[PDB]
Symmetry: C2
């Protein structure tokens, strides 16, 4: 899979999700990560995120894609496509 | 195209982007919208968003997909898949 991960997390866990996702996926916007993973990394990422998360005040959408998607970007880009 | 739109916008324009996107796309998480559009709607959405946006403090990624992507969701879901 290639995933894009976008989350809405409270200030008490938001620093934790960022540090965790940044060791599996590329950071491209605030609250948004993407990259290639395997089913190992995937459910590692996924449960790894559930442990971190209060599933009762917090939301993660992980879009499960074939491959890296084309995109378009308005405004202050934070991570040039090349770097991802 | 089918797009997922995720944005990071300052409090002075954040209410405007939401109201605008909500008339083209489905709201599924804070700062995240998705749905089917046409090239009319697309560049309508896209410039429509640039007018709203300070491209100098703000970011929009519009992922350009074939079709609606599969996904998985942790925690408080805000819009059951059926509704989108
Ligand atoms: Cl990163
Ligand atoms: Cl890929
Ligand atoms: Cl909506
Ligand atoms: Cl579709």
């Amino acid at each position: 899979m290639y995933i894009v991960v976008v989350y809405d997390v409270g200030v008490e866990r938001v620093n934790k999700v960022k540090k965790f996702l940044r060791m599996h996926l590329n950071w491209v916007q605030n609250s948004v990560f993407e990259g290639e993973v395997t089913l190992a990394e995937f459910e590692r990422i996924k449960e790894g995120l559930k442990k971190i998360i209060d599933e009762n005040s917090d939301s993660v959408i992980i879009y499960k894609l074939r491959s890296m998607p084309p995109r378009e970007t308005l405004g202050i880009e934070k991570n040039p496509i090349e770097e991802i």
